[PDB]
Ligand binder design. Sequence first.
Ligand code: 2X1
Ligand code: 2X1
Ligand code: CL
Ligand code: NA
Ligand code: NA
Lengths: 213, 213
Amino acid sequence: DTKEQRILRYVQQNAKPGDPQSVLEAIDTYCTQKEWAMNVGDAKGQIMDAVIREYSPSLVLELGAYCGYSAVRMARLLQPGARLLTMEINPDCAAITQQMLNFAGLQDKVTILNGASQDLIPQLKKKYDVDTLDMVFLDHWKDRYLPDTLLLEKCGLLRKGTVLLADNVIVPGTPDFLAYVRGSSSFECTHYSSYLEYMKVVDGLEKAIYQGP
Amino acid sequence: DTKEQRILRYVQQNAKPGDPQSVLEAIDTYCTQKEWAMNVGDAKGQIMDAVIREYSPSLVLELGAYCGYSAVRMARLLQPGARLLTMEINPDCAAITQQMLNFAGLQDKVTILNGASQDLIPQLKKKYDVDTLDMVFLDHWKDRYLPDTLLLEKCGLLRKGTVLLADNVIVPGTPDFLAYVRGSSSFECTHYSSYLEYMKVVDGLEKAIYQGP
Ligand SMILES: N=C(N)c1ccc(NC(=O)Nc2cccc(CN)c2)cc1
Ligand SMILES: N=C(N)c1ccc(NC(=O)Nc2cccc(CN)c2)cc1
Ligand SMILES: [Cl-]
Ligand code: NA
Ligand code: NA
């Protein structure tokens, strides 16, 4: 009986059907109460929104999904003609995510693929008629952030101005990923550190904008 | 011949009059060439914009102004009925700032006050008929950031949701300012680190949202 399952359940019992905002609130609440995650709206959500709004991407790729919070958060802001593609290796998390999008009524803005990013990324151009990406959201599996970044490049999926946003990038974590995008001339970087009301970083996010090879 | 005199000159010679974006582009382009300040539009301007857009303040107070870049950046986004108040202790910077807003055609959006923040702040409610502030932009003189913040609270000028944004808050600088706002429950805090394309932080900003006494 997983945490992400109990989150889904809580949403299904308490959120307003087809109301993404309600859904996000229900998640944020339960996790804060449970202390699985504190004020995800202010710590992570708000930052996601600002990035979406600054860039107004037509095509967003989410790599990694836990309970579907991030997918709802992004999908709810996408305008007609804009879409989210989501990848997650863990099948339960994938499914919870789908079910979470369903409840919000956002399922038609999103395409979920349950598989390894290493195997799925190279199929995007061929299998999925993707030429390049406007935005990528890296989530969940921090160890996959750098490999993913490198593979996207390799597959020719990034273009000048493609925005990467990675969640849960807090020192000393994801050491290899941060060093790379910061040191690389192909990435223009901005780090976001959410402290909420205290002194300890609650969430760290990295925005890295591809500057071409 | 001061740097901010020389920035003003460059703008006047090169930017399109009455064009804020042109003026912002003239200052960046010049400071960058002089290697006085790299890519201020990416490093600082874009963040300011994101904050203004998120919060849509009616009244912004800027404390500190060097050449006026920030005042132009913020004033160009304020809608009818919104206004900027700028305080700067150095009389030439204040005047450059005014002449810079003139060139951009933004002078009616702004009131510039020449004087010490400690002296001007307490006169705001009384002399300038302010109740509280929607946003405060701290700029230019980092040593004043903490005492400004405290005086603004003392003067009853912050309300729940008042957004403070401080420029040039790069560790190990302003350690007390940062420890104060993060340490205090009266502030909900987010740090922005702009790396541009490099390994090292170019500019750092702190958003602190007042949460009450
Ligand atoms: N690189 C990682 N951090 C990483 C790599 C691989 C995975 N795999 C799963 O979660 N598989 C899974 C998860 C749930 C259930 C099943 C099988 N039904 C398989 C996770 C994390
Ligand atoms: N706390 C600070 N960092 C601080 C405090 C005070 C000042 N004062 C001026 O710049 N005065 C000035 C500057 C130019 C000209 C004149 C008077 N003609 C006065 C600066 C910085
Ligand atoms: Cl929120
Ligand atoms: Na870089
Ligand atoms: Na705080």
